[PDB]
Symmetry: C6
Subunit: 191 residues, 6 copies
């Protein structure tokens, strides 16, 4: 069974996040490294400064988050497909038990999706505290001499897309919590 | 139900906007940053000047507008698909109530699409007042010394595509308003 | 209904134009701006000279022309699909009236396609009078000092593809006129 | 009807030519202009020399030849599809006449394909007499001073692919001639 | 027959590995060679240093591992499809023998997949002992004079993706071992 | 009819070769020319040296070999499809004759595939005797003065992929020979 409160909004928002990531990664974040430049004559300063200030790109983090969020759905879909194959073999009490075992698996999958979203949000907070990208950064990593100034490619557009993605992720978290609560309420109402 | 006055023209114009954006983004706006050049020896001036004068690219704004306009249609489609799944479960008074609840949802979706289009048009006006791109821009953002001249890649072609997109968006707004009015008239004629 | 004189040749020639544009845009016109070079030390001269001599690329104009020519077909197809949906609703005098109203819509769509093709041909004539691209151009746009010489990337190949596209467009115009005349003759023969 | 002598071999060889062109154009001919270099300090010499020695690229000529060869097949397919639509309308003496009119159209399409292949082969001979690309070319086109030496990107690989394409085209011409002769023989044997 | 313990988790984890590799190879490892730079004026030092420190790219090794792991599944699928074709020919004792022969083939395919995964993990350990990429490397390969410092493009992101892939591969190995043990237990329980 | 000994292994190994070539060509061999560099100030030395040492790229040779190996299968498939069309026309002694004529065609196709594979292997041996790519090459082709040193992009990775492809091709040759022998044995056993 499915609930219109949680499933439809989750699917549409997840599709929206996919479309936003597809738009952003190809064009906005494409030249994140090539356009990265520092005011220095020291060879190798640009690469080490980019690695220091961008350990992992925003689009890569978003793609990993989307994949990890998607994995429970793939797992439950494959499991139900195998169960229906077993049912088709049987055709060529127990069914109630199968449906019962299916129920908790879906609940656990929803909980795991919520946990994955929260973990990725916390990782994003740890790696990039400020939601807004800055135009100039100060670099002191070896072999850059003293401190040099480096310039990010597209701070404002990246900030806008970051705000969009963060708002979508937060709405997803809230909707997952609400869906879990509504599932609990429905289970209580059954009894 | 559907109305030939609003639905068909909306769909064809939305497809036309998709095709125009696909044509424009790949070629016209591809070198918007790489070809951006300023008359200065100061490192980092090009990137900061591009960020100042182009906080978000036109094609990215158009893609976001198209996605946001599309989201209500995806929501209503998913909701009706879930409702038909519930109907198929029932098969294996109330229907009139379901259709009634469906009606206002579609009306609200149309209103939300109109609001999204208007909001994106206003955002475009705020960010880029002039409809026509200019060949030369004056830059005074740090660390550019005093004021430097910078040159846009394809001002005229970008202006032409901007005019096309703006005309399409305005026609979409007018058609949405007309469709809402015609829906009100039809509802009144029913009673 | 359809006529073999106009519909089949129109469709095959339109597909041929699509294939030719796909071949040309990817390779021939890809480096139209990057390979554009002027004999000067003035920064920004290349971009302003390219914008002056190429306000809009040939491939972009051809793509816009193809899209605008295609839009009436999409409109009529969506409208007939909606009408067949209404017919299926009816199944679950008037039909002759529906077919009659369908007839003039198709005629007007053909006329609009012819007008669009003629308008795009006239625009091409206005923007690029000479059918053949030239190897060297003279530039005096600010900030280029005095007059400088600039060199086009692939004049001869672009000329060949321009001749192909122009011949196809002219044949399309002639075939549209002939189809309109034959439709008039058939309508007269009916009475 | 179809003949195994001509149709199957023609289709498989045409598919082989498509695959060979797809392999060649993406990689072999991709850097034909960017890697083109001349031993001179004169700006604009590279572009004019490339245009002089390569008026149209080999891959573009092959693609145009394939498209033009394909067009008669598309025309006859669309025409027979329209005729079958007319037959389906009739269902909801004359048929023998329709088949007879179909026969000469297919024969003329085959003749046109043969003529197109021969014309493209002659054009290739006129533009590039030598089948083998040369490593060094001598350039005297304005504004190149006196005569300069220019270097082609991949002479040997381009020569190999040119030999492959030319052999395929010649085999296609021979097979088309043989198919026409066999059609004449079969028509005579019918009487 | 299939087991839910091994098959579903294996398939979902293999799909997850495909998605992770698709995300990583296009963007993270794209500029692995172009961005590779060494602090020297000696021509050819960059290429030889990259070849010495990166004999084969991580993404290429992962793709080869995925292909080799996939090959047994393709082999068994093609073999069962041929067997079902033979069964369909028969339709137009022995079946038990066919199923028995099928069983050991699937077991051997699982064992081969486990061996391939272990071999690729050992190869990865041999080529890249440290799981984490380093920012700076020391090069002494001819013709680089003495020892030069070279800088890797994206050490931290590559390290993160390497950890992800290694964890997925190890989980796959453990799951394959568990599936083999469970198959042995089920075979014993049958007797 | 089909044989499980030859057909299934041939198909799976051919698919494996396709996947390996797809992995290799896009990334490994992409910068084979752009990254090619020689220690000289002579313009044009890089291009002529690359042409001398790499007359045709490894990936292009592998793609041509795969296409040529595939062509007999396409020919026999098209021929049997035409024969089944003739059979369907007949439906709307002789069949045994058709099957007999089909048999030798498939045998000849297998022999031609084996010959093509052997010929391409011999061509690879002639063009590149050493299986392993070398880091440094010595160039004396005009206009390079005296002898210069040039550096290959990715010698080790290219060597690994070359070994993979050569092993696959040799296994294909052996399997083709074995399939021919088994076909002869089966034909003898029939009598």
């Amino acid at each position: 069974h499915s609930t219109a409160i949680g499933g439809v909004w989750l699917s549409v928002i997840f599709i929206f996040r996919i479309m936003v990531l597809v738009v952003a990664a190809e064009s906005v974040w494409g030249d994140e490294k090539s356009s990265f430049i520092c005011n220095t004559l020291q060879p190798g300063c640009n690469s080490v400064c980019y690695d220091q200030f961008f350990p992992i790109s925003h689009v890569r983090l978003w793609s990993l988050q989307l994949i990890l969020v998607s994995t429970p759905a793939l797992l439950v879909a494959m499991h139900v497909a195998h169960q229906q194959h077993i049912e088709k073999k049987m055709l060529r009490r127990h069914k109630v038990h199968i449906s019962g075992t299916l129920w908790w698996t879906y609940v656990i999958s929803v909980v795991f999706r919520l946990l994955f979203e929260a973990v990725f949000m916390y990782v994003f907070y740890l790696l990039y505290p400020g939601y807004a990208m800055v135009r100039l950064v100060k670099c002191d990593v070896y072999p850059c001499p003293n401190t040099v100034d480096c310039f990010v490619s597209r701070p404002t557009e990246k900030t806008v897309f970051t705000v969009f993605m963060l708002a979508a992720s937060g709405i997803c978290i809230i909707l997952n919590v609400a869906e879990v609560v509504y599932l609990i309420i429905r289970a209580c109402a059954r009894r």
